[PDB]
Amino acid sequence: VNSFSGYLKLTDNVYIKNADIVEEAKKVKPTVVVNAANVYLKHGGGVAGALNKATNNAMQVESDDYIATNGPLKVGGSCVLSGHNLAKHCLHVVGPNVNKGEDIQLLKSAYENFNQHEVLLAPLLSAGIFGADPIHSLRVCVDTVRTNVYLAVFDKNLYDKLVSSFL
Ligand SMILES: C[C@H]1CCC(=O)N1Nc1ncnc2[nH]c3cc(F)ccc3c12
Ligand SMILES: [Cl-]
């Protein structure tokens, strides 16, 4: 048992809710919140801008030190950093950005990072400003992640479409 509340169960291990991931994280304080990161950990907008804003820019300060030491992430890759006031840890995962021409095939590799964590609160990778089809992202999530994932979908119209079209 865990404290995630109000989720619809899609599969044995995937759950979904119409929610603002920032407010969800602040309420639950999960072990892991997933950020929709880019390879530079520049948290300017979308989910990343919102998570970073909620940390009062502490996420960005930590991220800049990470990049200065390690260089950029790979598309499809991830790193574990602090969750600050939102979670114990933040798993920064880079899904392909279709608006940059990145290979959508890398979305499966991106979701594989979730399997290193038993339970996660996460957005749909490559959705939103990353330009992929969220219906597709949900399908890849369900067919790739084997650990327990609680998906937060900000947009109510999208949430309803994702549920109603789910196979
Ligand atoms: C990933 C895409 C897929 C459909 C959707 O709603 N997306 N975004 C979110 N998903 C969950 N929580 C969020 N909080 C946010 C705060 C922001 F400033 C901007 C975006 C989000 C957001
Ligand atoms: Cl977004």
Coordinates of N, CA and C and ligand atoms in Angstrom, one line a residue:
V1 N 0.8 -1.2 0.0 CA 0.0 0.0 0.0 C 0.9 1.2 0.0
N2 N 0.4 2.3 -0.7 CA 1.0 3.6 -0.8 C 0.0 4.7 -0.7
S3 N 0.4 5.9 -0.6 CA -0.4 7.1 -0.4 C -1.0 7.7 -1.6
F4 N -0.7 7.2 -2.8 CA -1.2 7.8 -4.0 C -2.8 7.6 -4.0
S5 N -3.5 8.7 -4.3 CA -5.0 8.7 -4.1 C -5.6 9.2 -5.4
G6 N -6.8 8.6 -5.7 CA -7.6 9.0 -6.8 C -7.1 8.6 -8.2
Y7 N -6.2 7.7 -8.3 CA -5.8 7.2 -9.6 C -6.7 6.2 -10.2
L8 N -6.8 6.2 -11.6 CA -7.4 5.1 -12.3 C -6.3 4.1 -12.6
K9 N -6.7 2.8 -12.5 CA -5.7 1.7 -12.7 C -5.8 1.3 -14.2
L10 N -4.7 1.5 -14.9 CA -4.7 1.1 -16.3 C -4.3 -0.4 -16.5
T11 N -3.3 -0.8 -15.8 CA -2.7 -2.1 -15.9 C -2.3 -2.6 -14.5
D12 N -1.7 -3.8 -14.4 CA -1.2 -4.3 -13.1 C -0.3 -3.2 -12.4
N13 N 0.5 -2.4 -13.2 CA 1.5 -1.6 -12.6 C 1.4 -0.1 -13.0
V14 N 0.5 0.3 -13.9 CA 0.4 1.7 -14.4 C -0.9 2.3 -13.9
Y15 N -0.9 3.5 -13.3 CA -2.0 4.2 -12.8 C -1.9 5.7 -13.4
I16 N -3.1 6.3 -13.5 CA -3.2 7.6 -14.1 C -4.2 8.5 -13.5
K17 N -3.9 9.8 -13.4 CA -4.7 10.8 -12.8 C -4.6 12.2 -13.5
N18 N -5.7 12.9 -13.5 CA -5.7 14.3 -14.0 C -5.2 15.1 -12.8
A19 N -3.9 15.6 -12.9 CA -3.3 16.3 -11.7 C -2.1 17.1 -12.2
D20 N -1.8 18.1 -11.5 CA -0.6 18.9 -11.6 C 0.5 18.2 -10.9
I21 N 1.5 17.7 -11.6 CA 2.5 16.9 -10.9 C 3.2 17.7 -9.8
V22 N 3.3 19.0 -9.9 CA 3.9 19.8 -8.8 C 3.1 19.6 -7.5
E23 N 1.7 19.8 -7.6 CA 0.9 19.7 -6.5 C 0.8 18.3 -6.0
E24 N 0.8 17.3 -6.9 CA 0.9 15.9 -6.5 C 2.1 15.6 -5.7
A25 N 3.3 16.0 -6.2 CA 4.5 15.8 -5.5 C 4.5 16.4 -4.1
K26 N 4.0 17.7 -4.0 CA 4.0 18.4 -2.7 C 3.1 17.6 -1.7
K27 N 2.0 17.1 -2.2 CA 1.1 16.3 -1.3 C 1.7 15.0 -0.8
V28 N 2.2 14.2 -1.8 CA 2.6 12.8 -1.5 C 4.0 12.7 -1.0
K29 N 4.9 13.6 -1.4 CA 6.3 13.5 -1.1 C 6.8 12.1 -1.5
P30 N 6.7 11.7 -2.8 CA 7.1 10.4 -3.2 C 8.6 10.2 -3.1
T31 N 9.0 9.0 -3.1 CA 10.4 8.6 -3.1 C 11.1 9.2 -4.4
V32 N 10.4 9.1 -5.5 CA 10.9 9.5 -6.8 C 9.8 10.3 -7.6
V33 N 10.1 11.5 -7.9 CA 9.4 12.3 -9.0 C 10.2 12.3 -10.2
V34 N 9.6 12.1 -11.4 CA 10.3 12.1 -12.7 C 10.1 13.5 -13.2
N35 N 11.3 14.1 -13.7 CA 11.3 15.3 -14.5 C 11.4 15.0 -16.0
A36 N 10.6 15.8 -16.8 CA 10.8 15.8 -18.2 C 11.9 16.7 -18.6
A37 N 13.1 16.2 -18.5 CA 14.4 16.9 -18.6 C 14.8 17.0 -20.1
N38 N 15.7 18.0 -20.4 CA 16.5 18.0 -21.6 C 18.0 17.6 -21.2
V39 N 18.8 17.4 -22.2 CA 20.2 16.9 -22.0 C 21.0 17.9 -21.2
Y40 N 20.7 19.2 -21.2 CA 21.4 20.2 -20.5 C 20.9 20.5 -19.1
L41 N 19.8 19.8 -18.7 CA 19.1 20.1 -17.5 C 18.8 21.6 -17.3
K42 N 18.4 22.2 -18.4 CA 17.9 23.6 -18.4 C 16.4 23.5 -18.3
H43 N 15.9 23.8 -17.1 CA 14.5 23.6 -16.7 C 13.7 24.8 -16.9
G44 N 13.5 25.1 -18.2 CA 12.9 26.4 -18.6 C 11.4 26.5 -18.7
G45 N 10.8 25.4 -19.0 CA 9.3 25.4 -19.3 C 8.8 24.0 -19.2
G46 N 7.5 23.8 -19.5 CA 6.8 22.6 -19.4 C 6.9 22.1 -18.0
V47 N 6.9 20.7 -17.8 CA 7.0 20.1 -16.5 C 8.3 20.6 -15.8
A48 N 9.4 20.6 -16.5 CA 10.7 21.0 -15.9 C 10.6 22.4 -15.3
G49 N 10.2 23.4 -16.1 CA 10.1 24.7 -15.6 C 9.2 24.8 -14.3
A50 N 8.1 24.0 -14.3 CA 7.2 24.1 -13.2 C 7.8 23.4 -12.0
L51 N 8.4 22.2 -12.1 CA 9.1 21.6 -11.0 C 10.2 22.5 -10.4
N52 N 11.0 23.1 -11.3 CA 12.1 23.9 -10.8 C 11.6 25.1 -10.1
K53 N 10.5 25.8 -10.6 CA 9.9 26.9 -10.0 C 9.5 26.6 -8.6
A54 N 8.9 25.4 -8.4 CA 8.4 25.0 -7.1 C 9.5 24.8 -6.1
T55 N 10.8 24.5 -6.6 CA 12.0 24.4 -5.7 C 12.7 25.7 -5.5
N56 N 12.1 26.8 -6.0 CA 12.7 28.2 -5.8 C 14.1 28.2 -6.5
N57 N 14.2 27.5 -7.6 CA 15.4 27.4 -8.5 C 16.5 26.6 -7.9
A58 N 16.3 25.9 -6.8 CA 17.3 25.0 -6.2 C 17.6 23.9 -7.2
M59 N 16.6 23.3 -7.8 CA 16.8 22.3 -8.8 C 17.7 22.7 -9.9
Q60 N 17.6 24.0 -10.4 CA 18.4 24.5 -11.5 C 19.9 24.6 -11.0
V61 N 20.1 25.2 -9.8 CA 21.4 25.4 -9.2 C 22.1 24.0 -9.1
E62 N 21.4 23.0 -8.6 CA 22.0 21.7 -8.5 C 22.3 21.1 -9.8
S63 N 21.4 21.3 -10.8 CA 21.6 20.8 -12.1 C 22.8 21.4 -12.8
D64 N 23.0 22.7 -12.7 CA 24.1 23.4 -13.3 C 25.4 22.8 -12.8
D65 N 25.5 22.5 -11.5 CA 26.7 21.9 -11.0 C 26.9 20.5 -11.6
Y66 N 25.8 19.7 -11.7 CA 25.9 18.4 -12.3 C 26.4 18.4 -13.7
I67 N 25.9 19.4 -14.5 CA 26.4 19.5 -15.9 C 27.8 19.9 -16.0
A68 N 28.2 20.9 -15.1 CA 29.6 21.3 -15.1 C 30.6 20.2 -14.8
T69 N 30.2 19.2 -14.0 CA 31.0 18.1 -13.7 C 30.9 17.0 -14.7
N70 N 29.8 16.7 -15.2 CA 29.5 15.4 -16.0 C 29.2 15.6 -17.4
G71 N 28.9 16.9 -17.9 CA 28.5 17.1 -19.2 C 27.1 16.7 -19.4
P72 N 26.5 16.9 -20.6 CA 25.1 16.6 -20.9 C 24.7 15.2 -20.8
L73 N 23.5 15.0 -20.5 CA 22.9 13.6 -20.6 C 22.7 13.2 -22.1
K74 N 22.4 11.9 -22.3 CA 22.0 11.4 -23.6 C 20.5 11.5 -23.7
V75 N 20.0 11.7 -25.0 CA 18.6 11.5 -25.2 C 18.3 10.1 -25.0
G76 N 17.3 9.8 -24.2 CA 16.9 8.5 -23.7 C 17.6 8.2 -22.3
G77 N 18.4 9.0 -21.8 CA 19.1 8.8 -20.6 C 18.5 9.5 -19.4
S78 N 19.2 9.4 -18.3 CA 18.7 10.0 -17.0 C 19.8 10.2 -16.0
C79 N 19.5 10.9 -15.0 CA 20.3 11.0 -13.8 C 19.4 11.2 -12.6
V80 N 19.9 10.7 -11.4 CA 19.2 10.9 -10.1 C 19.8 12.1 -9.4
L81 N 19.0 13.1 -9.1 CA 19.4 14.2 -8.3 C 18.4 14.4 -7.1
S82 N 18.6 15.4 -6.3 CA 17.7 15.6 -5.2 C 16.3 15.9 -5.6
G83 N 15.3 15.5 -4.8 CA 13.9 15.9 -5.0 C 13.6 17.2 -4.3
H84 N 14.5 17.8 -3.6 CA 14.3 19.1 -2.9 C 13.1 19.0 -2.0
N85 N 12.2 20.0 -2.1 CA 11.0 20.0 -1.3 C 9.8 19.2 -1.9
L86 N 10.1 18.5 -3.0 CA 9.0 17.8 -3.7 C 9.0 16.3 -3.5
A87 N 10.1 15.7 -3.3 CA 10.3 14.2 -3.3 C 11.6 14.0 -2.6
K88 N 11.9 12.7 -2.3 CA 13.2 12.4 -1.9 C 14.2 12.6 -3.0
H89 N 13.9 12.0 -4.2 CA 14.8 12.1 -5.3 C 14.0 12.6 -6.5
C90 N 14.7 13.2 -7.5 CA 14.2 13.5 -8.8 C 15.0 12.7 -9.8
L91 N 14.3 11.9 -10.6 CA 14.8 11.2 -11.7 C 14.6 12.1 -13.0
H92 N 15.7 12.7 -13.4 CA 15.6 13.6 -14.6 C 15.8 12.6 -15.8
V93 N 14.7 12.5 -16.6 CA 14.7 11.6 -17.8 C 14.5 12.4 -19.1
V94 N 15.4 12.2 -20.1 CA 15.3 12.9 -21.3 C 14.6 12.0 -22.4
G95 N 13.4 12.4 -22.7 CA 12.7 11.8 -23.8 C 13.1 12.6 -25.1
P96 N 12.9 12.0 -26.2 CA 13.2 12.7 -27.5 C 12.2 13.9 -27.6
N97 N 12.8 15.0 -28.1 CA 12.0 16.2 -28.4 C 11.7 16.2 -29.9
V98 N 10.5 16.0 -30.3 CA 10.1 15.9 -31.7 C 10.4 17.3 -32.4
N99 N 10.2 18.3 -31.6 CA 10.4 19.7 -32.2 C 11.9 20.0 -32.4
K100 N 12.8 19.1 -32.0 CA 14.2 19.1 -32.3 C 14.6 18.1 -33.3
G101 N 13.6 17.3 -33.8 CA 13.9 16.3 -34.8 C 14.5 15.0 -34.2
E102 N 14.3 14.8 -32.9 CA 14.9 13.6 -32.2 C 14.1 12.3 -32.5
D103 N 14.8 11.2 -32.5 CA 14.2 9.9 -32.9 C 13.2 9.5 -31.9
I104 N 11.9 9.4 -32.3 CA 10.9 8.9 -31.4 C 11.1 7.5 -30.8
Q105 N 11.9 6.7 -31.6 CA 12.2 5.4 -31.1 C 12.9 5.4 -29.7
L106 N 13.6 6.5 -29.4 CA 14.3 6.7 -28.1 C 13.4 6.8 -26.9
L107 N 12.0 6.9 -27.2 CA 11.1 7.0 -26.1 C 11.1 5.8 -25.3
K108 N 11.2 4.6 -25.9 CA 11.3 3.4 -25.1 C 12.5 3.3 -24.2
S109 N 13.7 3.7 -24.7 CA 14.9 3.8 -23.9 C 14.7 4.7 -22.7
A110 N 14.0 5.9 -23.0 CA 13.7 6.8 -21.9 C 12.9 6.2 -20.8
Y111 N 11.8 5.5 -21.1 CA 11.0 4.9 -20.1 C 11.7 3.7 -19.4
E112 N 12.7 3.1 -20.0 CA 13.4 2.0 -19.4 C 14.1 2.5 -18.1
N113 N 14.4 3.8 -18.0 CA 15.0 4.3 -16.8 C 14.1 4.1 -15.6
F114 N 12.8 4.1 -15.8 CA 11.9 4.0 -14.7 C 12.0 2.7 -14.0
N115 N 12.5 1.6 -14.7 CA 12.6 0.3 -14.1 C 13.6 0.2 -13.1
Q116 N 14.5 1.2 -12.9 CA 15.4 1.2 -11.8 C 14.9 1.6 -10.5
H117 N 13.6 1.9 -10.4 CA 12.9 2.5 -9.3 C 11.6 1.8 -9.0
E118 N 11.3 1.3 -7.8 CA 10.2 0.5 -7.5 C 8.9 1.2 -7.7
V119 N 8.8 2.5 -7.3 CA 7.6 3.3 -7.4 C 8.0 4.7 -7.9
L120 N 7.2 5.3 -8.8 CA 7.5 6.7 -9.3 C 6.3 7.5 -9.5
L121 N 6.3 8.8 -9.3 CA 5.3 9.7 -9.8 C 5.9 10.4 -11.1
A122 N 5.2 10.4 -12.2 CA 5.8 10.8 -13.4 C 4.8 11.5 -14.4
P123 N 5.4 12.3 -15.3 CA 4.6 12.8 -16.4 C 4.8 11.8 -17.6
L124 N 3.9 12.0 -18.6 CA 4.1 11.2 -19.9 C 5.4 11.8 -20.6
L125 N 6.4 11.0 -20.8 CA 7.6 11.4 -21.5 C 7.3 11.8 -22.9
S126 N 8.0 12.9 -23.3 CA 8.0 13.5 -24.7 C 6.6 14.1 -25.0
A127 N 5.7 14.2 -24.1 CA 4.4 14.9 -24.3 C 4.6 16.4 -24.1
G128 N 3.5 17.1 -24.2 CA 3.6 18.6 -24.0 C 4.5 19.2 -25.0
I129 N 5.4 20.1 -24.5 CA 6.2 20.9 -25.4 C 7.3 20.0 -26.1
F130 N 7.5 18.7 -25.7 CA 8.4 17.9 -26.4 C 7.8 17.3 -27.7
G131 N 6.5 17.5 -27.9 CA 5.9 17.4 -29.3 C 5.5 16.0 -29.7
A132 N 5.6 15.0 -28.8 CA 5.1 13.6 -29.2 C 3.6 13.5 -29.0
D133 N 3.1 12.5 -29.5 CA 1.7 12.1 -29.3 C 1.5 11.5 -27.9
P134 N 0.8 12.1 -27.0 CA 0.7 11.5 -25.6 C 0.0 10.2 -25.6
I135 N -0.9 9.9 -26.6 CA -1.5 8.5 -26.6 C -0.4 7.5 -26.9
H136 N 0.5 7.9 -27.7 CA 1.7 7.0 -28.0 C 2.6 6.9 -26.8
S137 N 2.9 8.0 -26.1 CA 3.7 7.9 -25.0 C 3.1 7.0 -23.9
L138 N 1.8 7.1 -23.7 CA 1.2 6.2 -22.7 C 1.3 4.7 -23.1
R139 N 1.2 4.4 -24.4 CA 1.3 3.1 -24.9 C 2.7 2.6 -24.6
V140 N 3.7 3.4 -24.9 CA 5.1 3.0 -24.7 C 5.4 2.8 -23.2
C141 N 4.8 3.7 -22.4 CA 5.0 3.5 -20.9 C 4.4 2.2 -20.5
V142 N 3.2 1.8 -20.8 CA 2.6 0.6 -20.4 C 3.4 -0.6 -20.9
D143 N 3.9 -0.5 -22.1 CA 4.6 -1.7 -22.7 C 6.1 -1.7 -22.3
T144 N 6.6 -0.8 -21.5 CA 8.0 -0.7 -21.2 C 8.3 -0.7 -19.7
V145 N 7.5 0.0 -18.9 CA 7.7 0.1 -17.5 C 7.1 -1.1 -16.8
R146 N 7.8 -1.7 -15.9 CA 7.4 -2.9 -15.1 C 7.2 -2.5 -13.7
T147 N 7.9 -1.5 -13.2 CA 7.7 -1.0 -11.8 C 6.4 -0.2 -11.7
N148 N 6.1 0.3 -10.5 CA 4.8 0.9 -10.3 C 4.9 2.4 -10.6
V149 N 4.1 2.8 -11.6 CA 4.2 4.2 -12.0 C 2.8 4.9 -11.9
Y150 N 2.8 6.1 -11.3 CA 1.7 6.9 -11.1 C 1.9 8.1 -12.0
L151 N 1.1 8.2 -13.1 CA 1.2 9.2 -14.1 C 0.2 10.4 -13.8
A152 N 0.8 11.6 -13.8 CA 0.0 12.8 -13.6 C -0.1 13.5 -15.0
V153 N -1.3 13.8 -15.4 CA -1.6 14.4 -16.7 C -2.3 15.8 -16.3
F154 N -1.6 16.9 -16.7 CA -2.1 18.2 -16.3 C -3.4 18.6 -17.0
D155 N -3.6 18.3 -18.2 CA -4.7 18.7 -19.1 C -5.9 17.8 -18.9
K156 N -7.0 18.3 -18.5 CA -8.2 17.4 -18.3 C -8.7 16.8 -19.6
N157 N -8.8 17.6 -20.6 CA -9.3 17.1 -21.9 C -8.3 16.0 -22.4
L158 N -7.0 16.2 -22.2 CA -6.1 15.1 -22.6 C -6.3 13.9 -21.8
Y159 N -6.4 14.0 -20.4 CA -6.6 12.9 -19.6 C -7.8 12.1 -20.0
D160 N -8.9 12.8 -20.3 CA -10.1 12.0 -20.7 C -9.9 11.3 -22.0
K161 N -9.1 11.9 -22.9 CA -8.9 11.2 -24.2 C -7.9 10.0 -24.0
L162 N -7.0 10.2 -23.1 CA -6.0 9.0 -22.8 C -6.8 7.9 -22.2
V163 N -7.7 8.1 -21.3 CA -8.4 7.0 -20.7 C -9.4 6.4 -21.7
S164 N -10.1 7.2 -22.4 CA -11.2 6.7 -23.3 C -10.6 6.0 -24.5
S165 N -9.4 6.3 -24.9 CA -8.8 5.6 -26.0 C -7.8 4.5 -25.6
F166 N -7.7 4.2 -24.3 CA -6.7 3.2 -23.8 C -7.1 1.8 -24.2
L167 N -6.2 1.1 -24.8 CA -6.5 -0.3 -25.2 C -6.0 -1.2 -24.1
Ligands
LIG1 C1 3.7 16.1 -20.3 C2 2.4 16.7 -20.8 C3 1.4 15.6 -21.4 C4 0.0 16.1 -21.0 C5 0.2 17.0 -19.8 O1 -0.7 17.4 -19.1 N1 1.6 17.4 -19.7 N2 2.1 18.2 -18.8 C6 2.0 18.1 -17.5 N3 1.6 16.9 -16.9 C7 1.4 16.8 -15.6 N4 1.6 17.8 -14.7 C8 2.0 19.0 -15.2 N5 2.3 20.1 -14.5 C9 2.7 21.1 -15.4 C10 3.1 22.4 -15.2 C11 3.4 23.2 -16.3 F1 3.8 24.5 -16.1 C12 3.4 22.7 -17.6 C13 3.0 21.4 -17.8 C14 2.7 20.6 -16.8 C15 2.3 19.2 -16.6
CL2 CL 4.5 20.5 -21.3

